[PDB]
């Protein structure tokens, strides 16, 4: 079934990313899996694509810089790009290109610090202060500006 | 109001993180803001805490390694930890400790590759293949295992 193929895709892609990252080095998300046949599929597609992939490196760096993907907009961009990739048809090479785009997108967003986690922690902090009465306390002490007296004088 | 204090908290925390990361270096999310008074508050709290914070570095590294926070569980852990921090009362120092925990948590999750973005892209890939008929195509070509013939022979 295609639910089975979808399940297998997780192992294929994770193995693909693991082995592609190795062959290009010289991203800790990409170094951390135990697989089998699907692991072999991902490995082989990464290996045999290496010469092709490297010739595209320069322009994908320029294009991804212009796109400015973030964790917030990555889903929207991924979907539009992947839909367009397959509009005129599916073949094995375009399927591998989808894995390669996932690789490049994950790497670019992580290494440019666009993963959004600090922004997520910022929302944690604000949300906690608002809903657990910390903001109330700071307001009654005179607001954040009152902290300017700490270490002052 | 405490909605105002909550809004100000975003600038305080982002400035706090920006300046703390500078003083400890020698995370690109932490290098990327334009503020004013709240920026000054965050800067000052990071600066005057430096000697105290560094004495806690060793044990927070051990504790965060044991906790194993990820983007998936960070909210749950943040909330439990922050609630416990203030259980016996609020004071300015504990408020600063909350900003410091947010800093440490964001840094640890990013640098250990626990930000979850590759896992998010993996879900993008699987979801697209399932809902945009790519998995159907691969199934009719014999499944992912059929890709083992690419580059073979």
């Amino acid at each position: 079934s295609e639910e089975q193929v979808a399940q297998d895709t997780e192992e294929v892609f994770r193995s693909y990313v693991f082995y592609r990252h190795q062959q290009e080095q010289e991203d800790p998300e990409m170094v951390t899996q135990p697989s089998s046949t699907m692991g072999q599929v991902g490995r082989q597609l990464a290996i045999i694509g290496d010469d092709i992939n490297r010739r595209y490196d320069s322009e994908f760096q320029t294009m991804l810089q212009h796109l400015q993907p973030t964790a917030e907009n990555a889903y929207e961009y991924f979907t539009k790009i992947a839909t367009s990739l397959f509009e005129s048809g599916i073949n094995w090479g375009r399927v591998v290109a989808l894995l390669g785009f996932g690789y490049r997108l994950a790497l670019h967003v992580y290494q440019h610090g666009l993963t959004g986690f600090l922004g997520q922690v910022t929302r944690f902090v604000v949300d906690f202060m608002l809903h657990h009465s910390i903001a109330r306390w700071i307001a009654q002490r005179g607001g954040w500006v009152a902290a300017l007296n700490l270490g002052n004088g | 109001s405490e909605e105002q204090v909550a809004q100000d908290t975003e600038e305080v925390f982002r400035s706090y993180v920006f300046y703390r990361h500078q003083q400890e270096q020698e995370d690109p999310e932490m290098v990327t803001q334009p503020s004013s008074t709240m920026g000054q508050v965050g800067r000052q709290l990071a600066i005057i805490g430096d000697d105290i914070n560094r004495r806690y570095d060793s044990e927070f590294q051990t504790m965060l390694q044991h906790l194993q926070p990820t983007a998936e569980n960070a909210y749950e852990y943040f909330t439990k930890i922050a609630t416990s921090l203030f259980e016996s009362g609020i004071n300015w120092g504990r408020v600063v400790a909350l900003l410091g925990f947010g800093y440490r948590l964001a840094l640890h999750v990013y640098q250990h590759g626990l930000t979850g973005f590759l896992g998010q892209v993996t879900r993008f890939v699987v979801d697209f293949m399932l809902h945009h008929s790519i998995a159907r195509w691969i199934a009719q070509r014999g499944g992912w295992v059929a890709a083992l013939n690419l580059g073979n022979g």
Binding site: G49, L64, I81, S84, L85, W92, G93 | -
Partner: peptide, 25 residues
């Protein structure tokens, strides 16, 4: 000029078609 996401999709397709021509035998 072409939007970045349009250009990326065009080059992904080019790349994939090169892979396909290379290996789909």
């Amino acid at each position: 000029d072409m939007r970045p996401e349009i250009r990326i999709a065009q080059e992904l397709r080019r790349x994939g078609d090169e892979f396909n021509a290379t290996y789909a035998r």
